[PDB]
Write a protein that binds this ligand. Structure first.
Ligand code: HEM
Length: 153
C-alpha cells in the first residue's frame, strides 16, 4: 500500500506526462523495444519497424502509446482502488496478447527511464521510489488477475 504522500509524488509526475502523452508513449515503447527486443515480437502491427526513425514516424505506434499511458494513468489515479480498470487489461493481456509479468517489469523499467530522462527535477529518489511502488502494486494485482483467468505468466 502506498502512503498518501507517495501517491501525490506519482500523480505530480504523471501530470507532467499528460502535457505530451503521445511523445512520452513513443519514448517508452521505443525504449522497451530497444532494451528488450523480444517484447517487439508480441506486436504483429509493429514487429516490421526496423529503425528508431521508422518507430517515431509510425502513427500506429504513437496512437498505441497513447492508449497504454491513458489506461495506466487511469489506474494510477485510483491510488490502488483499480479493480474495475485492471480487470479488462488483465483479460486482454493474459488471454489475447499473452504478456508475462517479466515483460511488465521491462515496460515499468522503460517508464521509469523516460520519466527520469524528461523530468529529473520532478523525479528524484523519493518520486522514483513512489512510482516504483505504484508499478510494483500494478504488477502484483495484474498477476493475481492473470491467475484467476488461468494464465501463469
Ligand atoms: C503498463 C503496461 C501496459 C498497459 C497499461 C497496456 C495497455 C494496453 C491497452 C490499453 C491496449 C489496448 C486494449 C487491449 O487490447 O487491452 C493494449 C494492447 C496491447 N498490448 Fe498492452 N499494455 C501494457 C503492457 C504491454 C506489454 C509490456 C506488452 C508486450 C510486451 C503489451 C502488448 C500489447 C499488445 C500486443 C496489444 C495489442 C496491440 C494491437 O495490436 O493493437 N502490453 N495494451
Amino acid at each position: 500500500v502506498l502512503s498518501e504522500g507517495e501517491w501525490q509524488l506519482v500523480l505530480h509526475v504523471w501530470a507532467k506526462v499528460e502535457a505530451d502523452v503521445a511523445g512520452h508513449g513513443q519514448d517508452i515503447l521505443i525504449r522497451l523495444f530497444k532494451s528488450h527486443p523480444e517484447t517487439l515480437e508480441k506486436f504483429d502491427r509493429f514487429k516490421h519497424l526496423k529503425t528508431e526513425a521508422e518507430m517515431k514516424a509510425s502513427e500506429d505506434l504513437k496512437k498505441h502509446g497513447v492508449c497504454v499511458l491513458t489506461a495506466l494513468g487511469a489506474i494510477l489515479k485510483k491510488k490502488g482502488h483499480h479493480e474495475a480498470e485492471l480487470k479488462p487489461l488483465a483479460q486482454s493481456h493474459a488471454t489475447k496478447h499473452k504478456i508475462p509479468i517479466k515483460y511488465l517489469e521491462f515496460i515499468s523499467e522503460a517508464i521509469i527511464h523516460v520519466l527520469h530522462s524528461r523530468h529529473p527535477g520532478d523525479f528524484g529518489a523519493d518520486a522514483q521510489g513512489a512510482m516504483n511502488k505504484a508499478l510494483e502494486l500494478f504488477r502484483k494485482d495484474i498477476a493475481a488477475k492473470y491467475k484467476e483467468l488461468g494464465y501463469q505468466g
